[PDB]
Design an enzyme around this catalytic site. Sequence first.
Site, short mmCIF file in Angstrom:
data_model
loop_
_atom_site.label_atom_id
_atom_site.label_comp_id
_atom_site.label_asym_id
_atom_site.label_seq_id
_atom_site.Cartn_x
_atom_site.Cartn_y
_atom_site.Cartn_z
N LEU A 22 0.82 -1.20 0.00
CA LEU A 22 0.00 0.00 0.00
C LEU A 22 0.86 1.25 0.00
O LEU A 22 0.52 2.21 -0.67
CB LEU A 22 -0.95 0.01 1.19
N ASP A 139 0.28 15.16 16.22
CA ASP A 139 0.63 15.22 14.81
C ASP A 139 -0.60 14.99 13.92
O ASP A 139 -0.65 14.05 13.12
CB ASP A 139 1.77 14.26 14.46
N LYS A 141 -2.60 15.57 10.88
CA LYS A 141 -2.53 16.07 9.49
C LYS A 141 -3.52 15.35 8.56
O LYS A 141 -4.17 14.38 8.97
CB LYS A 141 -1.09 16.03 8.95
C1 LIG Z 1 -6.54 0.06 0.27
O1 LIG Z 1 -6.43 1.49 0.30
C2 LIG Z 1 -5.19 2.08 0.22
C3 LIG Z 1 -4.66 2.45 -1.02
C4 LIG Z 1 -3.40 3.04 -1.09
C5 LIG Z 1 -2.82 3.44 -2.42
O2 LIG Z 1 -3.51 4.04 -3.22
N1 LIG Z 1 -1.56 3.08 -2.68
C6 LIG Z 1 -0.88 3.41 -3.92
C7 LIG Z 1 0.38 4.13 -3.43
C8 LIG Z 1 1.42 4.29 -4.54
N2 LIG Z 1 1.73 2.99 -5.17
C9 LIG Z 1 2.67 3.25 -6.27
C10 LIG Z 1 0.53 2.32 -5.70
C11 LIG Z 1 -0.49 2.09 -4.58
C12 LIG Z 1 -2.67 3.26 0.08
C13 LIG Z 1 -3.21 2.88 1.31
C14 LIG Z 1 -4.47 2.29 1.38
N3 LIG Z 1 -5.08 1.89 2.54
C15 LIG Z 1 -4.64 1.95 3.82
C16 LIG Z 1 -3.40 2.49 4.18
C17 LIG Z 1 -3.04 2.51 5.52
C18 LIG Z 1 -3.93 2.01 6.45
C19 LIG Z 1 -5.16 1.48 6.07
N4 LIG Z 1 -5.48 1.47 4.78
C20 LIG Z 1 -3.28 2.17 7.78
C21 LIG Z 1 -4.04 1.69 8.98
N5 LIG Z 1 -2.08 2.74 7.63
N6 LIG Z 1 -1.98 2.92 6.25
C22 LIG Z 1 -0.86 3.49 5.79
C23 LIG Z 1 0.13 3.85 6.71
C24 LIG Z 1 1.34 4.43 6.36
CL1 LIG Z 1 2.53 4.82 7.64
C25 LIG Z 1 1.62 4.69 5.03
C26 LIG Z 1 0.68 4.35 4.06
C27 LIG Z 1 0.91 4.73 2.63
C28 LIG Z 1 0.64 3.95 1.51
C29 LIG Z 1 0.85 4.47 0.23
C30 LIG Z 1 1.27 5.79 0.03
C31 LIG Z 1 1.48 6.59 1.14
C32 LIG Z 1 1.28 6.08 2.42
C33 LIG Z 1 1.53 7.04 3.55
N7 LIG Z 1 2.67 7.35 3.84
O3 LIG Z 1 0.50 7.53 4.23
C34 LIG Z 1 -0.54 3.78 4.45
#
Ligand SMILES: COc1cc(C(=O)NC2CCN(C)CC2)ccc1Nc1cc2c(cn1)c(C)nn2-c1cc(Cl)cc(-c2ccccc2C(N)=O)c1
Length: 284
Positions: A22, A139, A141
Site C-alpha cells: 500500500l 501530529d 494532518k
Molecule cells: C486500500 O487502500 C489504500 C490504497 C493506497 C494506495 O492508493 N496506494 C498506492 C500508493 C502508490 N503505489 C505506487 C501504488 C499504490 C494506500 C493505502 C491504502 N489503505 C490503507 C493504508 C493505511 C492504512 C489502512 N489502509 C493504515 C491503517 N495505515 N496505512 C498506511 C500507513 C502508512 Cl505509515 C503509510 C501508508 C501509505 C501507503 C501508500 C502511500 C502513502 C502512504 C503514507 N505514507 O500515508 C498507508
Amino acid sequence: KEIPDVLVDPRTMKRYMRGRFLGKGGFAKCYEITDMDTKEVFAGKVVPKSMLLKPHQKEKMSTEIAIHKSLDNPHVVGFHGFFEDDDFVYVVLEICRRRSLLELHKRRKAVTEPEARYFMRQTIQGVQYLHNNRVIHRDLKLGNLFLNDDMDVKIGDFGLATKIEFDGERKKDLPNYIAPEVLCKKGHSFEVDIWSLGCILYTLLVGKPPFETSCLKETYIRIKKNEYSVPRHINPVASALIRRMLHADPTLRPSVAELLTDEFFTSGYAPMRLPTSCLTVPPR
Ligand SMILES: COc1cc(C(=O)NC2CCN(C)CC2)ccc1Nc1cc2c(cn1)c(C)nn2-c1cc(Cl)cc(-c2ccccc2C(N)=O)c1
C-alpha cells in the site's frame, strides 16, 4: 531482508497473508494483510528491528502501540493486535481503502463548504474521544485522517501522541502544523490538537496550507509570528471559527466540545454521508 509471505504470531496464533503493498511512512512499510482463516482484511505496518536497533527509538513505537491499543472508536483506526518475529515488528490495523484526506485535498484543491463541515465534524468527534480519554494526538494532518469505502474519517498515526497523567499537566518534550507554544518550548497541552484542526479546516476550505512556504525554516518563523490570512473569499462565519482555532494564546482556542456547537457547523448545509465521487470531483 525478505518479508514473509505469511505472517504468524506466538500470540493470537492467526496467520496473515501479506498482499499488495500500500505504501511507506518513515521506516514503516504498509501492506494489505488478509486473515488466512477468517479472510478478514487489515492494514499491517511493517517495521524492521534494524530500524529500532536503538532502545530509544524502540520506545517511541511501544509508546504509540500502548496508546493505540487502548482506543476503540468509529473515528479512530481500529487497533487489531501487534506482534513480532526476529527481523520485523508488525502492527495490525483497520484497513482504509480510500487513502487519506491528503490525497483527496491534492486532487481536489479547495473543497466545498458542506464537505469540509462533514469532514471536520467527523474528525473533531474522534478528536473528542481522544481528549475525553486524556490523549493528545500532536501530529494531526490530512495524511492521518484516513478514509474508507464509506467516506468515514478515521484518525490514525500516533507516532507523536502522548497520554496526560495528572490534572493540569504541561508537556515539554517531543509534526506538521505545530502550534506556536510547541516552538517556543513554553509547554504544550490539549490545545495543540485544536490548532491542527484549525489548520486542516483552512487547508480544506482554501486549497493551500495556511503556513505553506517552500523553505522549511521560513515556516517556523511564520507560525511563531502568527503570520497567516484568510482570503476575503471565505465565508465570514467560517473565517471567524478558523481564527479562534488558530489563536496565538492557547487558552483562547475553542475546546473540542465548543467546536461542534459553533455557528459554522450549525448554519449551513451539513450532509451526513458523502459519495466516493468527492475523491475526484465536487458533489452535485
Ligand atoms: C486500500 O487502500 C489504500 C490504497 C493506497 C494506495 O492508493 N496506494 C498506492 C500508493 C502508490 N503505489 C505506487 C501504488 C499504490 C494506500 C493505502 C491504502 N489503505 C490503507 C493504508 C493505511 C492504512 C489502512 N489502509 C493504515 C491503517 N495505515 N496505512 C498506511 C500507513 C502508512 Cl505509515 C503509510 C501508508 C501509505 C501507503 C501508500 C502511500 C502513502 C502512504 C503514507 N505514507 O500515508 C498507508
